[PDB]
From a paper:
LdBDF5 contains a pair of bromodomains (BD5.1 and BD5.2) in an N-terminal tandem repeat. Bromodomains contain ∼110 amino acid residues which fold to form a bundle of four antiparallel α-helices (αZ, αA, αB, and αC), connected in a left-handed topology. Two variable loops (ZA and BC) form a hydrophobic acetyl-lysine binding pocket containing conserved asparagine and tyrosine residues involved in the recognition of the acetyl-lysine substrate.
In addition, we determined the crystal structure of unliganded (apo) BD5.2, enabling comparison with the structure of a BD5.2-bromosporine complex. The two (A and B) chains of BD5.2 in the asymmetric unit can be overlaid using SSM superpose routines to give an rmsΔ of 0.98 Å for 139 equiv atoms. Each chain adopts the canonical bromodomain fold, comprising four antiparallel α helices with a prominent ZA loop (joining helices αZ and αA) containing additional helical elements. Crystals of bromosporine-bound and unliganded BD5.2 are isomorphous, and the two chains in the asymmetric units can be overlaid using SSM superpose routines to give an rmsΔ value of 0.65 Å for 272 equivalent atoms. The clearest difference between the liganded and unliganded BD5.2 structures results from the implied movement of W263 accompanying the binding of bromosporine. In the absence of bromosporine, the side chains of W263 adopt different rotameric conformations and partially occupy the volume taken up by the compound. The conformation of Trp263 in the unliganded BD5.2 structure is similar to that of the corresponding Trp93 in the BD2-bromosporine crystal structure. Overall, we suggest that the bromosporine binding to BD5.2 in the crystal structure is an artifact of crystal packing and that bromosporine is, at best, a low-affinity ligand of this domain.
Residue numbers in the entry:
A (entry chain A), B (entry chain B): 162 to 300
Write the structure that this text describes.
Amino acid sequence: AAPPSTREMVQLVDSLNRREDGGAFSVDVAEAYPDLRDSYRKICPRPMNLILMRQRAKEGYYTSGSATVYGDTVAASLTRLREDIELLVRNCITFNVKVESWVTLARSFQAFAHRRVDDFVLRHAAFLRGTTMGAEVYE
Amino acid sequence: AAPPSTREMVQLVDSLNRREDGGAFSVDVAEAYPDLRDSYRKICPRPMNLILMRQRAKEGYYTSGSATVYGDTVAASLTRLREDIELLVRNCITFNVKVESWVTLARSFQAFAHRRVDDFVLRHAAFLRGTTMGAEVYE
């Protein structure tokens, strides 16, 4: 199948912004909390949020060069975007581990995000129908 | 005319916990984030949250000694509780000053909390009906 366009990838990332999340995954923590940045970066050495992900989508980072677009399964497709989703969730759960509202939100976003990517892959790549889904692998 | 009981004060404070707030105003930021303890104390040196406020209620702080229970207006009643609500709000806004959603939530809570106190005052001191309400004046 043809790779998704960058516009399609941007639309996909845009679709990951849920009003229910209240901008939780869109905020650059290091910029918004300068006095906690060192403490945050200790626990979360790698930045990730939906602003960075939309920049990556717009640039072709998820769909160009060495990026895996279609893998041998749905789960194994759009690996760079899946890794970013996984890092967003990992950072949230690790740093906010003692706050149940945050962890619950993070897990809800994780499941939602992988389902959205799964659906997107299947819309573009019918040859991957019935293979392992990202929603089944990630958790 | 009788001051509220300690149990009534504890129930009032507990009524300030909203499910939708996800523990925003109940979490002890030091306790949930033990390694941020000293950093937080530096930004918000006088902590306030609904757990501390419930403890203060149990200790009789909101109605004993020099406390103003019923003033000349609703807004002028239960001043020590109102002062704690205000500190809770100020600390939230201080810490989250670069995150507009947090500030919006803190201001939403401020109004809700004062209105809860206002309604409580009017149930215990119906003579104050028609006087200035704290929800209008504490902004």
